[PDB]
From a paper:
Shelterin is a hexameric nucleoprotein complex responsible for maintaining the integrity of the ends of our chromosomes, known as telomeres. POT1 binds single-stranded, telomeric DNA with high affinity and specificity.
Interestingly, the HJR is an insertion of the OB-fold and comprises residues P392-L538. Further stabilization of the bilobal POT1C structure is mediated by a Zn2+ ion coordinated, tetra-cysteine cluster (C382, C385, C503, C506) locate at the interface of the two domains. TPP1(PBD) is an extended coil with four alpha helices distributed throughout the protein. Interestingly, TPP1(PBD) is organized in the opposite orientation (N—to—C-terminal) to that of POT1C so that the N-terminal portion of TPP1(PBD) (α1) interacts with the HJR while the C-terminal one interacts with the OB-fold.
Author numbering:
A (entry chain B): 266 to 326
B (entry chain A): 332 to 633
The structure:
Amino acid sequence: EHQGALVCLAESCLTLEGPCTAPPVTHWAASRCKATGEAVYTVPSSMLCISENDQLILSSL
Amino acid sequence: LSATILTDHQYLERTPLCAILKQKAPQQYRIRAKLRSYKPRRLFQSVKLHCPKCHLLQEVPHEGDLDIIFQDGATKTPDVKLQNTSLYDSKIWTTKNQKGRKVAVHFVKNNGILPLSNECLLLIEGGTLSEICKLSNKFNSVIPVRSGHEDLELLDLSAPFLIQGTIHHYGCKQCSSLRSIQNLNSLVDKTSWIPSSVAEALGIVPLQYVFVMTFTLDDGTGVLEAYLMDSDKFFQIPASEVLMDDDLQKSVDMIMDMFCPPGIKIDAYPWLECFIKSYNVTNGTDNQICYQIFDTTVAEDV
Ligand SMILES: [K+]
Ligand SMILES: [K+]
Ligand SMILES: [K+]
Ligand SMILES: [Zn+2]
């Protein structure tokens, strides 16, 4: 049956005995973990927000 | 050759930076400038999540955070919730040497039948991040869920509401008003799993991945700070995929190194041609003008 096959496929992705394995880590993901001691770069949301009124004027150009 | 090109408004005359800085907002401009410097210097910090509804900007959870969330989410007692029988079939697996944890997998049906694996949406309670990643490769999509008092429910929105392939979809905590899993029943079309359809069914306002950067631009007449808030136009690299792909990351690194080659003088940097809009920002009592890059992309010969 197809249900059985899906259940077998799902089971094959699971680690049901002992410790579970480690997902892949890309170089930026690893770097994001190591960047300490200085506040993470951010921009306050308000600095990026173009008001509706300004958007109105802008779209008419 | 210029390092970036305009994708629109090509008819505009170039405006020097000194003239822009003396003018009132809001206006649109074409510019040609060197990228004197940029933030973030740590390029891996440029990837943010942005709400189109409330305009909030936030961090993408670290991979380690998700790992801990899913570890902490381990449960001995997942429920099927029997009232949802026509929505999904369910299986629960027991474990050995894992503190009695159980994994529940719910297989969502299309039109009364279980579809092919690549068309199948899964709901999972008690899975590890590693299990969820594997399931996301073999099935269409994964929604992490927990057993609520009445129904299955999404985990805290700090975990992705949907993992499809390697794309992690996140919801806005301010704008969303979560509905329980049974509301997936309201989807008349289950023949494909469109992230925004899952989101609407669950009352989620999805966050959008963006590269956010601060460009210090210089044409010799003045210096202008312009924000980049780019989903996939500027770099021609999707911000939603970049954190999961070493080659995409390497491409962004190479593009930025091209704008600002190390150990050469600014005159020897390539020109960037950009379209920008100016606009007024109020943070209480005083006005401020800000600038954003739009309709600009990296050129062909990188
Ligand atoms: K949709
Ligand atoms: K100068
Ligand atoms: K030059
Ligand atoms: Zn929001």
